[model samples]
Target: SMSVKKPKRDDSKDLALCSMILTEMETHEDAWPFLLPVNLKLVPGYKKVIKKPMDFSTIREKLSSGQYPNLETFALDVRLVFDNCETFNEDDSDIGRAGHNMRKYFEKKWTDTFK
Candidate 1:
């Protein structure tokens, strides 16, 4: 018997697929508002309300820059975009409706492509 100490979790595939899915969501029509960080000032407490502001563009850069350690890290950022959406937008409002659809769209591709 032989024992070796080496733990290397390759994320090449994860990175590739993550980017592919990112672009898919980015180009989606519902992605308009979620594309970049909010302009802010429109809502007075936006800064206070959103403790951790996140957006597709930021996540896009993080992923492309290899800032994520694994697919889960990438997935969490994606989830944040929607979580912040629900926190800021109303369910029946136009942006809220778009956020809902965007969440559904992202989750479907997430499970389909990853798990």
Candidate 2:
């Protein structure tokens, strides 16, 4: 009877490969749509940045100054994660229309709240 040999597992090589693959795959646009939100959710302060007003400038200043505030504070600036919602246009893409619709939804809600 012939004995089968098992392949050796190399932790360092596996880690290096994983790190490289993760870095590459994580940044690619094709990979971004799926990975972005999931990673954003894992981030400590994502939810607080995008609730209603979506004020990211404060978070940007904090991050620039080397201070990472709580998740709620971070969520107040979800645009930092996605960046420049203003550039979204109804002319360019479907996501743009989605963005426009979302902005309109929130704007109406914000306006209604004041009434």
Candidate 3:
């Protein structure tokens, strides 16, 4: 018998967060065309900008559709977390917290389906 594994209770909440982050990252797309030209001129030891994990279409969809309530907060929190990563020395953990919080939020919201 084939059974669909129920998505984790927190999936929607987490997805909401992920979706928002993707949208925020996509906002930077406008700069890419100009930035690309200068990218190759970088000094040998310079670090590259971090890449976003989401595709453009999906991000636009989420942002335009307003599918996630926590999107704004999550985006703000993510920026802070990244900026503070050097001083905090715990980037991974904080990222986990942000992710976990979103998951929990989603799980709570979708309890009836999971249960």
Candidate 4:
């Protein structure tokens, strides 16, 4: 017989850090632009794969709704959005670099927040 896995419990510290990052992104203009490429049609199947670009508001709402079980999972979901962007490269465009930087930002944030 197959057994189902139980969902992990949410951590208060993780939630606090995730909230902080979302709040900061709300004030950061670069954040939104980085997400814009995800919505562009130039990236093949972008719309079909991702459906919609993830923004601060979208993430904030998801987190508030408790759709994610933990900060790590939420962060991974956020990373998936950027990872799906076909043109995301540090050498090509500023937006590409911005996307990379955003990923780095989250990496450091997660480390610092948990450490």
Candidate 5:
């Protein structure tokens, strides 16, 4: 039986959506700090504090190379980036605010695209 559930999706089209969101966040004004990995060289303790450090560059790398299996995996890394943002920066700090907006934007676009 087909189970009447149509959750299956074509990866080619889904990857395009993933790419679209990544491109959008890349140009977002507050997205500068999150464009790449945190400057661990500048703040050596960054790794010590954040066990998992995620960024758009790495996610893009994963996607382009086909490491990301689906949108769920894609969302995980995206949320990881923002979650680390909140963990490292104060709620009212500049990066914190930027991450807040960036996360909101991503969530909105994701919902509109897939939900």
Candidate 6:
């Protein structure tokens, strides 16, 4: 019988990289806009409803627990958050620029982490 040996998964490196990026984001005022919830006060009975932004903490926890099978999967999940930015629009508005900057930062960091 032939046995296939899968590569060992080491998420420590990825976790460290993500932590660094998150720490930088925490100090950036632009990042806060994306992290805050959106209030829909105009809609009836929607005043109490808040659309929460993407929480990277969940991703960090999942990565720490080795929930992601691979770096590509983790990157995809992270990209999705920025890709879904409602305010992103061709870098026209401040929100759009912020989203674009974050995406660019993620791409560069992802490459750097692997290298």
Please identify model 2 stretches exceeding 4 Å from their true place: 1-83, 88-90
Q: Per-residue lDDT tens digits of candidate 5, residues 28-110?
A: 88898788888888976798999999998999899999898778999999999999999989988888899899999999999
- Encode model 6's per-residue lDDT on 1-115: one tens digit a residue: 2687778767667666766876665466667545543334543433333232354665666767878776677777667667656433456777778777777777887777685
> What does the lDDT read for residue 92 in candidate 3?
61
For each candidate, the alpha-carbon lDDT, in order, equals: 0.88, 0.40, 0.41, 0.66, 0.90, 0.63
What's the residue-level lDDT of 1 in candidate 4? 29
Which regions of candidate 3 fall more than 4 Å away from where they truly are? 1-52, 55-92, 112-115
Ten residues in sequence with the least summed lDDT for candidate 1: 1-10
Record all residue pairs in model 1 with backbone atoms less than 3 Å apart, i.e. clashing: none
Model 3: per-residue lDDT, tens digit, 31-85? 2211122232553322244233222353345455765465444444344333332
Q: What overall lDDT, based on C-alpha atoms, would model 6 receive against the true structure? A: 0.63
TM-scores, one per candidate: 0.87, 0.29, 0.24, 0.67, 0.90, 0.60
Please tell me which predicted candidate would have the highest TM-score against the true structure.
Answer: 5
Tell me the spans in candidate 6 whose CA falls farther than 4 Å from its real position: 1-12, 37-53, 57-69, 86-90
Report the poorest 10 consecutive residues by lDDT, candidate 5.
Answer: 1-10
For candidate 3, the lDDT comes to 0.41
**What's model 4's lDDT at 8?**
59
Q: Can you give the lDDT of residue 3 in candidate 6?
A: 86
* CA lDDT, candidate 4, residue 80: 67
For 10-66, candidate 2 gives per-residue lDDT tens digits of 433433332343344334443323233423456544455444322323333454564
Q: Per-residue error at 103 for model 4, in Å? A: 1.1
Ranking 3 against 4 by lDDT, winner:
4
Provide the RMSD of all predictions against the true structure, rounded to 1 decimal.
3.1, 17.4, 11.2, 4.8, 2.2, 5.0
Relative to the true structure, candidate 1 reaches a TM of 0.87
Best by lDDT: 5
